[PDB]
Amino acid sequence: LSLMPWFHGKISGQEAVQQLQPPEDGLFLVRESARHPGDYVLCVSFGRDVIHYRVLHRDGHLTIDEAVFFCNLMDMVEHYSKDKGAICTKLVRPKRK
């Protein structure tokens, strides 16, 4: 996870929105949640906006939609790069840190 190009660690929501400019559909990053210790936020550029998804923990697993769960963030990002599922658009380019 420390080696993931899309993982920006402890950056704020405002810093994440600034990182995802100029808008590019599917441009994305993952950050750590400050208000929810241990949780994450997946930030994705869509329709010139930045959409934020809280990544929750359920039974040790990770989830955005509480329908599909993953063991780790890497499997979650690989999934949402193949099909958008519950999120607005597929993950395409990782915004590098």
Burial group, residue 1, by CB count within 10 angstroms (0-12, 13-18, 19+): exposed
H or E element at residue 73:
helix 73-82
27-56 as b/e, with b when 16 or more CB fall inside 10 Å? bbbbbbeeeeeeebbbbbbbeeebeebebb
Which residues lie below 8 Å from residue 2, measured CB to CB, with a gap of 6+?
none
For residue 59, what is the domain's CATH number?
3.30.505.10
d(CA 56, CA 46): 21
Q: Which domain holds residue 58?
A: 1-97
The domain tally of the chain equals: 1
Taking the CB of residue 25, how many other CB atoms lie within 10 A of it?
A: 15
The tokens for 72 are 């780790």
Query: Closest Cα to residue 23, out of 48, 43, 52?
Result: 48
Burial group, residue 71, by CB count within 10 angstroms (0-12, 13-18, 19+): exposed
Which residues lie below 8 Å from residue 37, measured CB to CB, with a gap of 6+?
none
